[PDB]
Amino acid sequence: EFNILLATDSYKVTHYKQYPPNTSKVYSYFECREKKYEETVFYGLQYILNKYLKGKVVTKEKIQEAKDVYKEHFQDDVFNEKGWNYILEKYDGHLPIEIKAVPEGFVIPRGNVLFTVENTDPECYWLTNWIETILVQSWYPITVATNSREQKKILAKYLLETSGNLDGLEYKLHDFGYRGVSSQETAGIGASAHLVNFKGTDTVAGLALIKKYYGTKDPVPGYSVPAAEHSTITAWGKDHEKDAFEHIVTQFSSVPVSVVSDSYDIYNACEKIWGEDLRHLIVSRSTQAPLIIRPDSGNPLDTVLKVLEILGKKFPVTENSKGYKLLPPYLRVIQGDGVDINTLQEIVEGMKQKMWSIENIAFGSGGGLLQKLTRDLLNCSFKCSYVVTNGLGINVFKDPVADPNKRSKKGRLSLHRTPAGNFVTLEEGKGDLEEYGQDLLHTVFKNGKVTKSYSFDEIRKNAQLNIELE
Amino acid sequence: EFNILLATDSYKVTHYKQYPPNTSKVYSYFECREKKYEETVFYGLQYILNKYLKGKVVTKEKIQEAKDVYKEHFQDDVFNEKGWNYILEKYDGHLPIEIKAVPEGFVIPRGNVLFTVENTDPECYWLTNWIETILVQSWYPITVATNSREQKKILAKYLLETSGNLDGLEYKLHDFGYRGVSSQETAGIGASAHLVNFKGTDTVAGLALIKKYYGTKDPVPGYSVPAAEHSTITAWGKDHEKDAFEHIVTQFSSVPVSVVSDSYDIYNACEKIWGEDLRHLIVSRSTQAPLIIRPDSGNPLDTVLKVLEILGKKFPVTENSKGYKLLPPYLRVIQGDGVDINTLQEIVEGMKQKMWSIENIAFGSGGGLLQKLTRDLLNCSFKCSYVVTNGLGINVFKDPVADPNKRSKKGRLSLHRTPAGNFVTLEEGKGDLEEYGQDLLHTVFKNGKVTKSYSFDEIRKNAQLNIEL
Ligand SMILES: O=C(Nc1ccncc1)[C@H]1C[C@@H]1c1ccccc1
Ligand SMILES: O=C(Nc1ccncc1)[C@H]1C[C@@H]1c1ccccc1
């Protein structure tokens, strides 16, 4: 049982006593603060609204539980029982909050308002920032989606250059991160964010999240193929690696199959086992059912290049129309060790310099894709910009003397199109002057109800690369 | 509804067809592989066993659900419906698996077996590695607990050096990480791991997890105090920072209170607002209720030193018996911006060089404590080391030519004390020779039941520092 009264930073329990007396409104906003990663994919708020914020989220039992915990946690009675009881009694436990947000999947430059939050009842001035903690966790799906999309840009650039098209782009970066994230819940959220950009995942948790909170026309948003792990090779005994390989490709003779080949000696496996002993089982395969050789150790670039060099001398290689080398269609490689945005770039550039088409390769990324990310990467941050006290609206902000990068925006905010068609965030309520047309934010949550939402299909469309659009 | 059939890496769905025919046993183990972090705190498995693995985890509906998902996900029928149905029918959906583990809270050098997993029914040879993905997520609480403990070592060293004792050590690193982690579930897990070493947290989710899965004799495992955020200062208006400060310290006059002081100018706030205008509200406070000034921007070391310098000239400073400067007991500082294990070390060393006692300072850490960690830090890894095929046991392993650091252990494993009192992992079933005393791994899970559990108090005792001991 999730309890929103226990889902905030402890200190926020004490904030209702700290605001100016007679404050009726606290209005706050989220941005990926300006400080690469020049643009961000807005994704993941819909999950939070539906799972945690909507409907009757306050009960008598939840109030009592919070009261009991905080009494011990603070060694003192500081919890706002009356304020929560008010929400329970007046609104049947629905949060009197309004949230406006940019559409999910939208690609927005850094330093723009992405969503805003304010209380709709003056008694609940304290509620706006109570829910900061839970809303700020949107940093994670935003950051995974953004970083995944940046890798898609790299792949698109090199695939286009070496092959002349973008065929298969959406399968070129595969999610291997299930074991390498910090929890089951994180796995689902992160995998779903990667699927905004790609269709390949082994993190099964992502599928159910998308189906429940977003939805797609297709039965599932992501796909995989049969593949070995070291245990299914090594279990055969060291002297029987060939027997393992033969068994596995024969079991999966009519679908693609990935086979980890570095259990003992990746180079021997490629040149002698695949390239000689079992070559007859590989050259007979369909182009719809390639063997995908998987190295998993060594310097990622050096190993990929050597694997390709080996395979190129054992199998028929062609030269595509762009002048790049191409393995036969029944044979491909996947590099799934040590892959992050930096090493991805290094590998594709190294392949290009050695005249290997990016058609030859796919990438798997685990920790690099879903775990090795923090809220600091995009400076995802939630701040109060406007309050009303004694009936007077005041534009408020922070501006620390030793770090201008932490300055926050002032007043009521709105998001607009500029005359050149770019985004601009207007501060100090200046959107009301109507010199920049209509506010692009939409009300997505109001008084316990989700008022606007997006399918996963629409999110994917919003998050497309320009090069995909053209 | 969590469905264990959907809680694995997709490729594992296909592995039942890949093992050698006539394989009746797959035995696997977890270690923090040797490659700084020389010893690791084993913590978090009990959470996973109880939340996800125990009891009736297979149902007819869960089997059909997985069958339906995998058909679309693979565009093919590759799912082992028969194998899962066997578990449902024979074991009432309880997993025929045995897991043996070192006690939670134990501090073990890198490269040792921490837990092992094996099937208890020959039909379920494939199940051992099905659950690799979910068990390997134990890397997270192990790594948080370990990294938190390493920071405790740094704090203990410098606190002892500058003050002569370790009073308050368990409150010196406070968890600020709730907003900076990737999910609600991660928040609870990570916060609980930090609480193995410390008692201060604002990540409330950690308390409920500990209460549910571990338990403590005291009502709660972690504590906090009232504190401001920028919004409760800035809401007063730029020209009214002093009014906000005054209101807040007066509201919380008899308890400790942390007040963020850098909204506009941290140095002005310390020297003029706290140090002059409101000084009378500070020097009147109890030792049990200090003002805790909180900078939150600028170079962490430079800002801490400048804050201390300012306060030292506006408030009476003493020199303790070790020769280090000490603020009055009603005034302390907390640095809660940009703190990780590296910058923590930098700050305490810088303070020491400038003759400031570590008694003066506490640290808050958020992303650095709970998020900026990966499975690679301690090389947490799960590997098959033993199989039985055609009734014969075989010791198995990987040993990639280009990376000896990825070599895995061979055969049946056990963990023992050495004659000098250290730890050793015995391979190839050599523990059976009985030359190294009892195996330190205990059965914690067998056939759907959690067979051995630890309280959070026991875990804390096991994870103590030597200096504490
Ligand atoms: O290579 C694989 N899958 C694959 C390959 C090519 N296209 C799609 C999926 C799986 C063996 C890789 C894997 C998957 C999940 C975790 C760890 C390793
Ligand atoms: O300083 C604080 N708490 C504190 C201070 C000293 N001892 C214990 C807790 C809270 C204001 C810090 C905070 C807490 C949670 C998230 C972000 C920032």
Ligand nearest to the CA of B223: 2
Hey, are the CB atoms on B384 and A23 less than 8 Å from each other?
no
How far apart are the CA of B204 and the centre of ligand 1, in A? 37
C-alpha A59/C-alpha A345 separation (Å) is 51
Element holding A82 (H helix, E strand): helix A81-91
Residues B444 and B116: beta-carbon distance below 8 Å: no
β-partners of residue B116 are B29, B100
Q: Is A179 assigned a ligand-binding role in the annotation?
A: yes
Closest residue, chain B, to A395 (C-alpha): B237
Task: Determine the 3-state secondary structure of A114 from DSSP.
Answer: strand
Chain B nearest CA to A273, separation (Å)? 16
Nearest to B98 by CA among B457, B458, B455, B450: B450
For A237-265, the DSSP string reads -GGGHHHHHHHHHHHTSSS-EEEE--SS-
Q: Is A432 assigned a ligand-binding role in the annotation?
A: no
Q: Going by DSSP bridges, is the β-strand pair A331-335/A325-326 parallel, antiparallel, or unpaired? A: unpaired
Residue A409, C-beta contacts closer than 8 angstroms, at least 6 positions apart = A29, A31, A113, A383, A385, A397, A425, A427
Nearest to B459 by CA among B36, B41, B38, B129: B41
Mutation to test the A interface, candidates B131, B184, B246, most A Cβ within 10 Å: B184
How is residue A145 written in tokens?
A: 């989606």
Of A199, A225, A248, which is best to mutate to test ligand 1, by the most ligand atoms within 8 angstroms of its C-beta? A225
**Roughly what angle, to the nearest 10 degrees, separates helices B341-353 and B300-314?**
40
How is residue A142 written in tokens?
A: 């935003």
Residues A270 and A261: beta-carbon distance below 8 Å: yes
Closest C-alpha residue for ligand 2 atom 5: B258
The half-sphere exposure of A148 on its side-chain side, counting CA atoms within 13 A, is: 41
Asked whether the CA dihedral A208, A210, A214, A215 is positive or negative, the reply is negative
Nearest to A366 by CA among B44, B133, B253: B133
β-partners of residue A332 are A292
Residues B378 and B35: beta-carbon distance below 8 Å: no
Phi, psi of B417 (to 5 degrees): -80, 140
C-alpha B283/C-alpha A229 separation (Å) is 65
Q: Is B230 assigned a ligand-binding role in the annotation?
A: yes
Residues B166 and B467: beta-carbon distance below 8 Å: yes
Q: Is B412 assigned a ligand-binding role in the annotation?
A: no
Q: How far is CA A229 from CA A225, B130, B344, in A?
A: 13, 11, 40
The total number of residues written for chain B in this structure: 469
The half-sphere exposure of A425 on its side-chain side, counting CA atoms within 13 A, is: 24
Residues B10 and B71: beta-carbon distance below 8 Å: no
After what residues is chain A interrupted, C–N > 2.5 A?
A: 35
CA of A177, closest atom in ligand 1: 16
How is residue A306 written in tokens?
A: 């050597």
Task: Determine the 3-state secondary structure of A338 from DSSP.
Answer: coil
Q: Going by DSSP bridges, is the β-strand pair A380-389/A23-32 parallel, antiparallel, or unpaired? A: antiparallel
Structure's resolution in angstroms: 1.5
The half-sphere exposure of B196 on its side-chain side, counting CA atoms within 13 A, is: 34
Residues B185 and A2: beta-carbon distance below 8 Å: no
What residue type is B287 in one-letter code? T
Residues B215 and A223: beta-carbon distance below 8 Å: no
What residue type is B54 in one-letter code? K
Phi, psi of A34 (to 5 degrees): -70, 145
State which approach was used to obtain the coordinates. X-ray
Ligand nearest to the CA of A12: 2
C-alpha B347/C-alpha B307 separation (Å) is 13
What residue type is A317 in one-letter code? V
C-alpha A286/C-alpha B326 separation (Å) is 76
Indicate the Cα dihedral angle A335, A338, A344, A349, nearest 10°.
-80
Q: Is B296 assigned a ligand-binding role in the annotation?
A: yes
Hey, are the CB atoms on B11 and A226 less than 8 Å from each other?
yes
User: How many other β-carbons are positioned within 10 Å of the β-carbon of residue A54?
Assistant: 15
Residues B59 and B1: beta-carbon distance below 8 Å: no
For B227-285, the DSSP string reads B--HHHHHTT-GGGHHHHHHHHHHHTSSS-EEEE--SS-HHHIIIIIIIIITHHHHTTS
Which CB contacts under 8 angstroms, 24+ apart, belong to A436-440? Answer: A439/A100, A439/A414, A439/A415, A440/A102, A440/A414, A440/A415, A440/A416
Q: What residue ranges line ligand 1, CB within 6 angstroms?
A: A 174, 176, 200, 202, 224-225, 227, 258, 292, 294, 334, 336, 362, 364; B 9, 11
Q: Largest Cα–Cα distance in chain B?
A: 84
β-partners of residue A203 are B9
C-alpha A445/C-alpha A351 separation (Å) is 48
Residue B333, C-beta contacts closer than 8 angstroms, at least 6 positions apart = B292, B293, B294, B295, B304, B307, B308, B311, B327, B360, B361, B362
Of A8, A11, A383, which is best to mutate to test ligand 2, by the most ligand atoms within 8 angstroms of its C-beta? A11
Which of B14, B237, B403 is closest, CB to CB, to A298?
Answer: B403
What are the chain A neighbours of B300 within 8 Å (beta carbons)? none
Residue B287, C-beta contacts closer than 8 angstroms, at least 6 positions apart = B329, B330
What are the chain A neighbours of B223 within 8 Å (beta carbons)? 73-75
* A39 CB-contact burial (10 Å; exposed 0-12 / middle 13-18 / buried 19+): middle
How is residue A382 written in tokens?
A: 């939630």
Residue B294, C-beta contacts closer than 8 angstroms, at least 6 positions apart = B227, B228, B258, B259, B260, B261, B262, B333, B334, B335, B336, B364
Closest residue, chain B, to A14 (C-alpha): B226
Phi, psi of B369 (to 5 degrees): -85, -40
Q: SS in 3 state form for B153-184?
A: HHHHHHHHHHHCCCCCHHHCEEECCHHHCCCH
C-alpha A24/C-alpha A28 separation (Å) is 14
Residues A282 and A311: beta-carbon distance below 8 Å: no
**Roughly what angle, to the nearest 10 degrees, separates helices B205-213 and A60-74?**
100
Query: Residue holding tokens 């058909």?
Result: B71
Hey, are the CB atoms on B10 and A78 less than 8 Å from each other?
no
How far apart are the CA of B187 and the centre of ligand 2, in A? 16
CA angle at residue B192 from B189 to B198, to 5 degrees?
150
Fold classification of A137-374+454-470 is: TIM Barrel (3.20.20)
Q: Is B179 assigned a ligand-binding role in the annotation?
A: yes
C-alpha B184/C-alpha A290 separation (Å) is 41
C-alpha A93/C-alpha A448 separation (Å) is 8
Hey, are the CB atoms on A182 and B179 less than 8 Å from each other?
no
What residue type is A218 in one-letter code? D
Using only C-alpha atoms, what is the Rg of chain B? 26
What are the chain B neighbours of A396 within 8 Å (beta carbons)? 231, 234-235, 237-238
Asked whether the CA dihedral A352, A355, A358, A362 is positive or negative, the reply is negative
C-alpha B336/C-alpha B351 separation (Å) is 16
C-alpha A228/C-alpha A294 separation (Å) is 9
C-alpha B291/C-alpha B250 separation (Å) is 11
Ligand nearest to the CA of B291: 2
How is residue A132 written in tokens?
A: 């900061």
Residue A230, C-beta contacts closer than 8 angstroms, at least 6 positions apart = A260, A263, A296, B383, B384, B398, B408
Q: Is A202 assigned a ligand-binding role in the annotation?
A: yes
C-alpha A180/C-alpha A174 separation (Å) is 14
Q: How far is CA A235 from CA A99, A266, B99, B382, in A?
A: 55, 17, 20, 14
How is residue B38 written in tokens?
A: 């020389």
What are the chain B neighbours of A132 within 8 Å (beta carbons)? 179
Nearest to B372 by CA among B340, B395, B403, B332: B340
Nearest to B33 by CA among B409, B413, B303: B409
C-alpha B165/C-alpha B313 separation (Å) is 26
Chain A nearest CA to B465, separation (Å)? 25
Chain A nearest CA to B164, separation (Å)? 29
Residues A379 and A35: beta-carbon distance below 8 Å: yes
Q: How far is CA A342 from CA A297, A318, A345, A380, A417, in A?
A: 17, 29, 5, 22, 33
Residue ranges of the domains in chain A? 1-136+375-453, 137-374+454-470
Q: How far is CA B464 from CA A326, B149, B396, in A?
A: 58, 9, 36
For B330-357, the DSSP string reads TEEEEE-SS--HHHHHHHHHHHHHTTB-
How is residue B33 written in tokens?
A: 């592989």
CA angle at residue A46 from A211 to A136, to 5 degrees?
130
Hey, are the CB atoms on A179 and B10 less than 8 Å from each other?
no
User: How many other β-carbons are positioned within 10 Å of the β-carbon of residue B444?
Assistant: 22
C-alpha A133/C-alpha B12 separation (Å) is 36
Closest C-alpha residue for ligand 2 atom 1: B258
Ligand nearest to the CA of B231: 2
Element holding A142 (H helix, E strand): helix A139-163
CATH class of the region B137-374+454-469: alpha beta
Residue A304, C-beta contacts closer than 8 angstroms, at least 6 positions apart = A295, A333, A335, A347, A350, A351, A361
Query: Residue holding tokens 């409920």?
Result: B208
Of B231, B258, B297, which is best to mutate to test ligand 2, by the most ligand atoms within 8 angstroms of its C-beta? B258
Element holding A71 (H helix, E strand): helix A60-74
How is residue B406 written in tokens?
A: 């990825």
A141-150 burial, b at 16+ Cβ within 10 Å, e below that, comes to bbbbbbbbbb
Of B169, B171, B292, which is best to mutate to test ligand 2, by the most ligand atoms within 8 angstroms of its C-beta? B292
Nearest to A297 by CA among B190, B153, B407, B66: B407
Closest residue, chain A, to B262 (C-alpha): A400
Residue A243, C-beta contacts closer than 8 angstroms, at least 6 positions apart = A236, B20
Chain A nearest CA to B96, separation (Å)? 19
C-alpha A32/C-alpha B53 separation (Å) is 39
Residue B355, C-beta contacts closer than 8 angstroms, at least 6 positions apart = B323, B324, B325
Closest C-alpha residue for ligand 2 atom 16: B176
Chain A nearest CA to B3, separation (Å)? 10
How is residue A292 written in tokens?
A: 């995908």
Which of A247, A255, A394 is closest, CB to CB, to B237?
Answer: A394
Nearest to A7 by CA among A85, A82, A75, A84: A84
Nearest to B245 by CA among B210, B276, B205: B276
Hey, are the CB atoms on B7 and A184 less than 8 Å from each other?
yes
Which of B178, B222, B263 is closest, CB to CB, to A133?
Answer: B178
User: How many other β-carbons are positioned within 10 Å of the β-carbon of residue A466?
Assistant: 9
C-alpha B228/C-alpha B290 separation (Å) is 14
How is residue B176 written in tokens?
A: 């600020």
Q: Is A218 assigned a ligand-binding role in the annotation?
A: no
Residues B26 and A235: beta-carbon distance below 8 Å: yes
Chain A nearest CA to B253, separation (Å)? 13
Closest C-alpha residue for ligand 2 atom 17: B176
**Rounded to an integer, what is the distance from CA B450 to the centroid of its chain?**
22
Q: What residue ranges line ligand 2, CB within 6 angstroms?
A: A 9, 11; B 174, 176, 200, 202, 224-225, 227, 258, 292, 294, 334, 336, 362, 364
**Rounded to an integer, what is the distance from CA A270 to the centroid of its chain?**
35
β-partners of residue A117 are A28, A99
Q: Going by DSSP bridges, is the β-strand pair B442-446/B39-41 parallel, antiparallel, or unpaired? A: unpaired
Element holding A387 (H helix, E strand): strand A380-389
Q: What is the DSSP letter of B413?
A: -
Residues A177 and A191: beta-carbon distance below 8 Å: yes
Residues B385 and B29: beta-carbon distance below 8 Å: yes
